[PDB]
Amino acid sequence: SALTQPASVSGSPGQSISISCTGTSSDIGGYKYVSWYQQHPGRAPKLIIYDVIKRPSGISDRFSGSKSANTASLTISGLQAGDEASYYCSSYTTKKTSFFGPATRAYVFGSGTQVTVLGQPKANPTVTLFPPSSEELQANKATLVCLISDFYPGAVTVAWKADSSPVKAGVETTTPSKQSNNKYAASSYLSLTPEQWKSHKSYSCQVTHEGSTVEKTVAPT
Amino acid sequence: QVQLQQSGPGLVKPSQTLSLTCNVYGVAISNEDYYWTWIRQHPGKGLEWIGDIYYNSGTTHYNPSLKSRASVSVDLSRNQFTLKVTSVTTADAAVYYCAREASTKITDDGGAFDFWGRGTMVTVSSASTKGPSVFPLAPSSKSTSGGTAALGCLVKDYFPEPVTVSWNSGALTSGVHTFPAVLQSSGLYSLSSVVTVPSSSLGTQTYICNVNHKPSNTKVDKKVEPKS
């Protein structure tokens, strides 16, 4: 029911890129009130185009848009790194509330298109590994915290080791999430007992990312 | 000019009634140029127009998708408007946006949503809420590299999302990083908030994190000192 849109479209810096929004006759094909919304992870949407072509006050000339038949287009020229977000097309439409009766006003949105920028410099993650606090140990809990910030692309591999041997049970690892600076962050958690914590020489957190590996190690002291 | 505040995030039980409020600033709702609209965004999905209201007409309009389970109200004493969705199911859980619909001319049927709100997160679960446990991630020789030192708060065992973490009452903003939460097998969320700071500020300058869990109405203040 939502307007048709490509899940993702990509382009290198400086070049133009086009995002097509396919609709119907009851909207876009019929009405002049098509608009575009930009949404970075994970703030609220912001208006960038309305009435097909017109830009709000404060938007750059880089963002242009057009319409033809039942399809609209958003053309971003002079592409930049900050133009990496989600883009939704919206349109005015009319619908029947009951089976019959006057057609009530409504709005329909698109599925959304993820714009990726090409040729961004790879970044190595800043890794941190916190041991269990005394307070947590007093509560009979124990959680090792492995934090992984500011890496690019958003592909990383985390592993946990007890002393020198790997461990799979008790491991909870977040999926990478986009930061404002277009880099990715993530975190991992190893839940143990105070017994496992105090009955081992060291615990380690390995982070593998594009040929680079980083192993951080904590110990019970 | 326009500024829209939504109510705090929340848990709502199945088959109960969701109710969200939106405070408008910088422009009157009684205005004639603007329809006032509700839109939700489901987790990992596109947007969905819920319904709107136009004051001068007094007419409200809704999306047939909600089977007439949604109603929009207005309160001029505070210049606010509210949404009410009844008999909620798991499919109504989402991030709810409130927006102003503005046209080019009154003659124009439609327009676009120029101004939006930050969004309130609404989770639909019969399970009860739970305030977070706040453990101090203390600075040490481990969370250090030369002139910089990382200290944080572990916000463990809480439900539902979200949680607002700050440091020193929203004063220290330089170097703060809050990671998204893990979803444990138990269903409870957990996240860490770490601030990176100078090394020569651990003994003297104090660091207090402030955790706010609105869904369960919990607010915790924790000081993170160097271990001793």
Author numbering:
A (entry chain L): 2 to 9, 11 to 27, 27A, 27B, 27C, 28 to 95, 95A, 95B, ...
B (entry chain H): 1 to 35, 35A, 35B, 36 to 52, 52A, 53 to 82, 82A, 82B, ...
From the article:
CAP248-2B possessed an average length CDR-H3 of 15 amino acids, but had an unusually long CDR-L3 of 19 amino acids.
In the 3.1 Å resolution structure (not influenced by crystal packing), the 19 amino acid CDR-L3 formed a β-hairpin which was stabilized along its length by seven hydrogen bonds, and protruded ~15 Å at a right angle relative to the other CDR’s. The tip of the CDR-L3 ended in hydrophobic residues Phe95C and Phe95D that were angled by Pro95F and immediately flanked by residues Ser95B and Gly95E which may confer a degree of plasticity to this region. In both structures, the angle at which the CDR-L3 extended from the Fab was stabilized at its base by germline conserved hydrogen bonding interactions with CDR-L1, as well as a salt bridge formed between CDR-L3 residue Arg95I, and Asp50 in the CDR-H2.
